[PDB]
Amino acid sequence: GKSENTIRFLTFNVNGIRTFFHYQPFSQMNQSLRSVFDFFRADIITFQQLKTEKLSISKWGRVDGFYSFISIPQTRKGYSGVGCWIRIPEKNHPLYHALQVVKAEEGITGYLTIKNGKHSAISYRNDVNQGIGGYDSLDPDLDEKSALELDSEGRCVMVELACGIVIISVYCPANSNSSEEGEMFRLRFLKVLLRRVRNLDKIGKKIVLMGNVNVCRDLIDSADTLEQFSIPITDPMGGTKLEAQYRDKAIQFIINPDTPHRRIFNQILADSLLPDASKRGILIDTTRLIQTRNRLKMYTVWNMLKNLRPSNYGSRIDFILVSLKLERCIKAADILPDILGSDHCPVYSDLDILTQVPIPKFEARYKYNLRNHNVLEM
Template sequence: MEEILSQPPFTKIPIKKSNKTIRFLTFNVNGIKTICNYHPWNQFKQEFNDIFLSLKSDIITLQELKLTINTTLNEIKNIGHLKNYRSFISLPTKKKGYSGVGLFIKKPENDEEKQIYTVVKAEEGLTGYLSDKSGTRYRDQEDKIGGYTNDMSESEALNLDSEGRCVIVELINNLVIFALYCPANSQGTEEGETFRLLFLQQLLKRCENLHNLGKRIIIMGDINVSLDLIDSAEGINDRLGLKIIEDIRDGVNFEIENYKECINFKFSRKSRELMNKYVIQSMIYLLRDKQKINYSNYQIFYDTTRIYQGRRKKMYTVWNTLTSSRQINYGSRIDLILCNCTKMIKHTSNADILPFIQGSDHCPVFTDFENWNEENEEGKEKKDIMIELNKYQDKKIMFEAKNHFKLNKIRDISTLFGKRNFIESNGSSESISSSTSSRTSSPQPEISKDNKETETDQKSNSKKPKVLVYKSRKTIDNNKLSSSSKKSINDYFL
């Protein structure tokens, strides 16, 4: 792995400022099963723990996993049982094999990190109407994240949460993280637009409720909304064609000279208008005309990339790969990391896009915060965290992937090579392999129907190992993919 990381593009990934830096990263992978067929990820042999480490990030969300529970349990295990990260994964119950979101939290290595990365609560879905393995709806559980809205029926809520678009985790330091793949309505239908707006409304209203409860909040993922005109190459190009704006390279002067159209762009779609209502504006001379809407009662989120990078142009995060748009950087910025905490924003040490990372039509986006827990305004925050730590550090989180998908009941096929050690865990056999074992993509053999091996089977296995036939992974030939299976970049310029 060290040899891989010593080469581009990984040498281009910014090094964190210190060992106290906390890096958040979002990446729409456009298919977790296929990303490892492309450079640079094909060097990692499906080892997602190493992939995550290569991104030098502590809290990671991936969108468009494109997994289904029934047919790809092996792939779920690849990202659900990691050495250095805890996994929380939501998959769709309808439109199977579509969307899907994963949130991966660094496992703390010392007491100081436990005060940051310890997970105290986790939920699937946005509305709280889904249930974990206990059968109790999240919103009805005694120990819940909170902030739920009550302005929609349960059937509407379950439909909203049926596409695997949201994972929510609360950490011990009072930070609630929303990992999201927001709807795009790429087909342009009335039904799709209604669904999209309802999702954004419920998301932002719940965040507002949590904000009022004093929670720190991070929204990270593919939001599918370009907030500003400088975030949309197509928006700029269309207006240049109509000769209603001037093409100015510098972002600040571009927005000053084209102020009217930059403002109009913010109101050009209901989804964009809604997002801008909640995001604190960093545009120079913005809203000199405040007649359209009073933002002051709503704005709670900082766009971390914009706060750090200023009004930089062409900072796009998605491109149309069918038209070589990435090569000429004709794209859109729709992958965002938003934060409601002023203290955290003051501790931002870096925030940027990583366009040199290939493998998807999107690129990763990251934000670095220094350890804001060290700034103890009331003199008791760390004490409170330690009390909570004693309560939660050994708590079983039912929505954690290994529990939610019962991944501990699947034997790791890598243990068929070399020395094997077995432990009993909840009535199931788990195998522990050495660090040098290599993982393959072949289907993993299940234990037995009741997830236990009889003594006879164990003795038989120790004397005569089973003969297995392994098949190599077929690499997808992109040239054979039909154009209808790929998205137009116009679907992203929203």
């Protein structure tokens, strides 16, 4: 179970929020996200790949006892989409002032807009009281046209708490078709994201970056590559010995020039296998911290398989990454591969952290005007 006064972060690539509610035990919960969140005993939850539409936000955006922040594509339906939910504790709770949401933002670039008046619209970069900040040079040749296109697929939601913690929930592109246009989009997204994180860290923000990064960081987290190199997994807790016996191949997995995204992602992890990780990384893999590097077969995705978790198959591309200043707060971190309903499994981590501000305009009830989703609309 979870401790009494810790915040449980939960990430889950549901691969269709409507479809995941068709599996036990969630099929018994009448499509109630509140029942799901109480089932996992979670307080800050992010769901990636919602595959939803604006009409359905009247259901996923109103959760009793929670704040809802949801980002979907502007026009394309049933594609991508990220949601983040912050539990509202009671006034007599010690984490009441900590879990106060002071800001909320959509995207990584800051060029996305929020309703400002009748026909007016202002982006997050121009409003310092609503934008979280850290937009200082995310890319060398980044104009508004490319930044809006980079944020056009509903892949990021940002939430800032009163205790100075910025939660960044991402569903990074995967480039599943192996195209040149898709690979450049993937690399540009990752570089802008990690740069945005580095900017917020210099300002002094405690950063929790979690979600589906679609990047494998170490060789031991790739069932396909371990079979390609004929490396047998005999000891389920023999990860350190495997990385010592195959030190050369473990490093080649990261710095492989055919896969620069693996190198870019490792360059921000302080606990990376690269020797100079502690001199350049600022984020810590919470799951690898608690489970250690000995645990093998610690996979969070089994592509296209929602009903079974086969052996010798799968990867780990779902993470909960925290700033160095939050390493001393990690009390628990694991995965839940027995949960069915998606080709991904949930990942959770418990952190011990221990005037009024209006609700941010990006809250789902305001961003999507849920008070008007009535009969003619539905």
